């Protein structure tokens, strides 16, 4: 078939990890506005009939744990899976409130052999986070 | 008759590899703002990848950083769609 089957009983989970405030031992500034993003995302995906689960200020181990538990859930009546990460970052890396996590660590819980009830179903990762320190100065049209 | 274990992932990054991602202190991040607008306008008319391409265009053309620090001022941003999907995705 050309199109994913999206008429399962439920569209699926949409997990929003919103990290606004970090630990003083990380030194990174508070992320103003991310609460507007997380609220925008919640309403957008409710209108698309996803079960939205907002999380706030998770530590790097709480992230890994939440992703593991969700990966062990039963998605057999879900069409897809969505995860949104709002945080500081670098290439390959999303930040808990206390330090870095590899992005590959998070997504690996959902590999087709490790989360069978999602095999063959679209797994979406939306990542608001820096990926380095380069600056695009643009070019005038 | 297997499929790759890395198959059917889609990664919607707010910005190109190596680069900063920009966020408005009140309005929210350029990328999520645009992604929510684009989904509201077009999730009933377009395939997901085409929605994400309108996101790329909105962020790319409508946004430009504003900073009292001249180092960080008038900067631009292109998001990065990384798709290992094997079928089209329609939300309608």
């Amino acid at each position: 078939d050309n199109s994913y089957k999206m008429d399962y009983p439920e569209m699926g989970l949409c997990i929003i990890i919103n990290n606004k405030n970090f630990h003083k031992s990380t030194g990174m500034t508070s992320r103003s506005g991310t609460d507007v993003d997380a609220a925008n995302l919640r309403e957008t995906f409710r209108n698309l009939k996803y079960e939205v689960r907002n999380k706030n200020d998770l530590t790097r181990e709480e992230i890994v744990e939440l992703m593991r538990d969700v990966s062990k859930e039963d998605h057999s009546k879900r069409s897809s899976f969505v995860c949104v990460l709002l945080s500081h970052g670098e290439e390959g890396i999303i930040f808990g409130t206390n330090g870095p996590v590899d992005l590959k660590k998070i997504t690996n819980f959902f590999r087709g052999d490790r989360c069978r009830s999602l095999t063959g179903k679209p797994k979406l990762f939306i990542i608001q986070a820096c990926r380095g320190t380069e600056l695009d100065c643009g070019i005038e049209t | 008759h297997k499929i790759p274990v890395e198959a059917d992932f889609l990664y919607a990054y707010s910005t190109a590899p190596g680069y900063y991602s920009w966020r408005n202190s009140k309005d929210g991040s350029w990328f999520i703002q645009s992604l929510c607008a684009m989904l509201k306008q077009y999730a009933d008319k377009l395939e997901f990848m085409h929605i994400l391409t309108r996101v790329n265009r909105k962020v790319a053309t409508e946004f430009e950083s504003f900073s009292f620090d001249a180092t960080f001022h008038a900067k631009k941003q292109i998001p990065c769609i990384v798709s290992m999907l094997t079928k089209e995705l329609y939300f309608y």
């Binding site: 500034t29 945080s87 970052g89 820096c130 | 920009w22 966020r23 504003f66 900073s67 960080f72």
Partner: peptide, 5 residues
């Protein structure tokens, strides 16, 4: 203003 993530 704009700030970087």
């Amino acid at each position: 203003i704009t700030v970087k993530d």
